[PDB]
Amino acid sequence: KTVVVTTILESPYVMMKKNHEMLEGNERYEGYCVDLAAEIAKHCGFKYKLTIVGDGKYGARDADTKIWNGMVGELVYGKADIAIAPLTITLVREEVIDFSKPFMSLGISIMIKKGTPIESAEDLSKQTEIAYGTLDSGSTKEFFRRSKIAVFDKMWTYMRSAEPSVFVRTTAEGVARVRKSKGKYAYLLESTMNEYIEQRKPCDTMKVGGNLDSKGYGIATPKGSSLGNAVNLAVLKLNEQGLLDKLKNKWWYDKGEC
Amino acid sequence: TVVVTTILESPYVMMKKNHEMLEGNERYEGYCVDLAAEIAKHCGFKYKLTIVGDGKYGARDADTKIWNGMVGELVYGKADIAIAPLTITLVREEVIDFSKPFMSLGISIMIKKGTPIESAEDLSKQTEIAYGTLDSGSTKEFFRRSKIAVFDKMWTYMRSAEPSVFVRTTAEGVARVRKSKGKYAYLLESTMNEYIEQRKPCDTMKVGGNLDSKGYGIATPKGSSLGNAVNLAVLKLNEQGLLDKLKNKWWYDKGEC
Ligand SMILES: CC(=O)N[C@H]1CCN(c2ccc(C3=NO[C@H](CNS(=O)(=O)C(C)C)C3)cc2F)C1
Ligand SMILES: N[C@@H](CCC(=O)O)C(=O)O
Ligand SMILES: N[C@@H](CCC(=O)O)C(=O)O
Ligand SMILES: [Zn+2]
Ligand SMILES: [Zn+2]
Numbered sequence: 001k002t003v004v005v006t007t008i009l010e011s012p013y014v015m016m017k018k019n020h021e022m023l024e025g026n027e028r029y030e031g032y033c034v035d036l037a038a039e040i041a042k043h044c045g046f047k048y049k050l051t052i053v054g055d056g057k058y059g060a061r062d063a064d065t066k067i068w069n070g071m072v073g074e075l076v077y078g079k080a081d082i083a084i085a086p087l088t089i090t091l092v093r094e095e096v097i098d099f100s101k102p103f104m105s106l107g108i109s110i111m112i113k114k115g116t117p118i119e120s121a122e123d124l125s126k127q128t129e130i131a132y133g134t135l136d137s138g139s140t141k142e143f144f145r146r147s148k149i150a151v152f153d154k155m156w157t158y159m160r161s162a163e164p165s166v167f168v169r170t171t172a173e174g175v176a177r178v179r180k181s182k183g184k185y186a187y188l189l190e191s192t193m194n195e196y197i198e199q200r201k202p203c204d205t206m207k208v209g210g211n212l213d214s215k216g217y218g219i220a221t222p223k224g225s226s227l228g229n230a231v232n233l234a235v236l237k238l239n240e241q242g243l244l245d246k247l248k249n250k251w252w253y254d255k256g257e258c
Numbered sequence: 259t260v261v262v263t264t265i266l267e268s269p270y271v272m273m274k275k276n277h278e279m280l281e282g283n284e285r286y287e288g289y290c291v292d293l294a295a296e297i298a299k300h301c302g303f304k305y306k307l308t309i310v311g312d313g314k315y316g317a318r319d320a321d322t323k324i325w326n327g328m329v330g331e332l333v334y335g336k337a338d339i340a341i342a343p344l345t346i347t348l349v350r351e352e353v354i355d356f357s358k359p360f361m362s363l364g365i366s367i368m369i370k371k372g373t374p375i376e377s378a379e380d381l382s383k384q385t386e387i388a389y390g391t392l393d394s395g396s397t398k399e400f401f402r403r404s405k406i407a408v409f410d411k412m413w414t415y416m417r418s419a420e421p422s423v424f425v426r427t428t429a430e431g432v433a434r435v436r437k438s439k440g441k442y443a444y445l446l447e448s449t450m451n452e453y454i455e456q457r458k459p460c461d462t463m464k465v466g467g468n469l470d471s472k473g474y475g476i477a478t479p480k481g482s483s484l485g486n487a488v489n490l491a492v493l494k495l496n497e498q499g500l501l502d503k504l505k506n507k508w509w510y511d512k513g514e515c
Pocket of ligand 4: 296299500
């Protein structure tokens with residue numbers, strides 16, 4: 001059978017090719033997770049179909065309804081066979097889906113418009129003039145929600161209550177807000193994504209200070225799935241045969257415009 | 259009572275200065291000692307730290323196919339879990355189970371300060387400064403398998419080196435750097451490298467970026483019921499910030515340079 005892969009439009013992981021309209025199926029897309037999906041599939045020996053997650057989300061459990069949305073929900077409810085995406089490995093997700101060993105490491109980080117007087121999370125926590133926020137429905141938000149670290153607690157106490165909202169629907173909306181806000185909005189996002197944007201025109205953002213945590217992205221499968229074992233072993237193999245480092249270089253450092 | 263295999267390797271597991279008045283698990287201290295205690299407390303088991311009898315991480319004998327090291331202890335039923343700086347690798351995951359990683363690392367270069375070496379490419383292009391790795395671990399296997407030009411050239415040199423450039427233990431590698439007057443460089447994991455850089459006599463340095471990217475995981479025998487619980491405890495501990503607080507405790511707070 002053809003394996004249905006859920007993924008998400010998130011640069012440089014999965015992007016539409018400039019000429020996507022002239023192309024069909026898997027050929028419409030390019031990026032790190034596109035290349036990684038093709039390699040996983042070849043090695044494990046299956047055909048596949050890339051499908052972009054319908055609600056545009058990573059995945060969270062609605063606290064009232066109890067339903068999982070996003071990529072996670074496509075797995076949970078049987079709509080997709082695997083997620084190959086910058087999907088963060090978390091405890092609450094690992095309770096309902098399986099993850100491979102991580103294919104890429106990352107931490108939450110700070111994106112500023114260049115010149116903004118902010119060097120750290122501690123600096124953001126101690127002031128009010130520059131607003132800051134996270135993506136509205138993923139692992140970065142949940143991190144703040146849950147932290148007992150005083151600086152991050154203090155940051156959440158401000159973000160959860162700030163008006164108008166400091167949360168954004170997509171990474172791209174966060175980045176555009178940093179860029180348009182004259183130094184007055186800073187964006188909390190994964191280092192991977194921060195570092196990619198920092199090397200793209202108009203070259204007006206930068207990553208500041210250390211990462212706030214350490215984690216990784218994994219390949220996800222529905223709980224129990226037979227595909228999970230093989231996919232895990234393919235991730236390990238591909239790191240060890242150097243493929244993962246090669247794809248990082250291809251999609252980050254070889255694509256630098258700054 | 260769970261039998262935990264581990265290995266004496268600083269700052270993961272070390273005998274306390276005063277170990278001889280102490281008994282059982284209290285003889286030991288380090289990142290993996292504290293990690294073990296946290297895992298045990300969260301999954302609610304009693305445990306016994308035991309130091310791996312052959313002092314090795316784990317590799318398979320090419321001829322006999324026997325596994326040695328901490329990996330061997332799990333495979334042959336001698337220990338229930340390995341809590342150690344034990345690298346996740348494909349050949350190990352084929353015979354033992356690993357948690358999601360509790361720490362990231364890569365292979366890195368240790369020099370005696372002042373040595374004119376800045377990169378693996380620099381090591382590969384000269385013969386005056388010898389270099390090698392640990393035996394019987396993942397760093398060696400990385401070079402044995404690499405098809406990247408600079409690393410393949412490095413391996414061709416190391417395997418044929420006389421006298422041997424390989425060492426039995428991390429500590430032997432580090433002592434060979436410190437006494438070789440700049441003429442031996444040691445290839446070792448960045449974790450170990452960076453810890454030692456912060457210890458007296460303050461005469462080593464990590465130079466260059468890491469050559470690869472990997473992680474340490476908690477290991478259990480295949481199919482063990484402990485593997486599931488243990489992996490969930492690792493994730494919890496990371497998210498609660500315990501793993502960061504432990505790395506800060508044992509590297510940078512224990513810093514004397
Ligand atoms: C639970 C968790 O994620 N733990 C934290 C601490 C360490 N960890 C972590 C996250 C990501 C990585 C890596 N991502 O790609 C590199 C390859 N990973 S791997 O395990 O070697 C892979 C080939 C399966 C290493 C390595 C790591 F150690 C993140
Ligand atoms: N990788 C994240 C999305 C981005 C973020 O939350 O900053 C997730 O899986 O939830
Ligand atoms: N962490 C390594 C040992 C150290 C090394 O090879 O540099 C292993 O698990 O094999
Ligand atoms: Zn605890
Ligand atoms: Zn033999």
